[PDB]
Amino acid sequence: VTQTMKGLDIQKVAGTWYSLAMAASDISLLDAQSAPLRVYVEELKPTPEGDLEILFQKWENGECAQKKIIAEKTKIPAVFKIDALNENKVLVLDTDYKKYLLFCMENSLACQCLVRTPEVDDEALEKFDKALKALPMHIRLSFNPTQLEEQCHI
Amino acid sequence: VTQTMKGLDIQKVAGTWYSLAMAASDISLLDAQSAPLRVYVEELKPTPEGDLEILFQKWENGECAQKKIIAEKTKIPAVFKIDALNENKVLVLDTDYKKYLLFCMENSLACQCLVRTPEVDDEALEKFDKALKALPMHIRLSFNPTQLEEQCHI
Ligand SMILES: CCCCNc1ccc(C(=O)OCCN(C)C)cc1
Ligand SMILES: CCCCNc1ccc(C(=O)OCCN(C)C)cc1
Secondary structure, eight states, X not given: XXXXXXTOOGGGGOXXXXXXXXXXXXXXXXXXXXXXXXXXXXXXXXXXXXXXXXXEEEEETTEEEEEEEEXXXXXXXXXXXXESSSEEEEEEEEEOSXXXXXXXXXXXXXXXXXXXXXXXXXXXXXXXXXXXXXXXXOEEEEOOHHHHTSGGGO | OOOOOTXXXXXXXXXXXXXXXXXXXXXXXXXXXXXXTOOEEEEEEEOTTSOEEEEEEEEETTEEEXXXXXXXXXXXXXXXXXXXXXXXXXXXXXXXXXXXXXXXXXXXXXXXXXXXXXXXXXXXXXXXXXXXXXXXOOEEEEOOHHXXXXXXXX
């Protein structure tokens, strides 16, 4: 991935978001309620040091678990690191802070269209599909306003 | 769905096809290996009477089953009926006979991009995405050339 947000201000992504849409390189990354990159974002909390804590839900062991991860900053403002068995990158592609944010997680790849409200944002989906045009995605999911107001988008 | 192939010649769709891509109105229609509209097309056999027998595979009870369905003609050449508990329609959106065919099954909705060979047809995917632009799809899957040569696209 070689789309990053030039000039990103990480403090301005703070707050409420909805996972409107998701996509991944491999079907198995999103196909089941319990698939590993089926993660629903709740809230971003930038630290004063400029790390980004992520609140999200994950369907786990037949139910909707509350989860909390922190992505550590790098020399590149639009690029964060999650420590695990593998070195995994979080990239911010594009945001306008007040309506949408596009990002990817990569080691292979999953991306999302975040929005501030439980509404279908045709414009934000256009920009998302445009950004995926380049990437080798084999599954795409989108959610309706009813699902967006439910735990794990049921 | 109000995209049908004007002038369709049902005899000319006979033969080998690959389910390159699928999409559906509802995630649950395609999400699992065993989801009900995860059906992989093998072969179309038009009858002399102008019905269309469909050979396909379905992941069933932990394995890849061989299946055979016949879709009955209507007064509209691009529209067929499958008899079940519900009245279910098969619509041919568009074909060039020698490379691609787009169709939908509807009662709510699932569509596919068929191709004659195990190759990624960028052009045929463009026409497919164009045809879905209108429809309310919430899941899309595509398959690579390796998967296309395997039973149930493993
Ligand atoms: C704009 C930044 C959004 C980042 N959001 C998320 C990033 C990662 C995860 C997440 O669940 O991490 C997956 C685990 N690692 C080891 C692959 C969940 C949400
Ligand atoms: C160009 C025509 C292609 C039609 N292909 C297919 C049509 C239907 C099916 C199929 O599996 O039918 C689903 C069962 N009914 C009752 C909803 C599988 C393949």
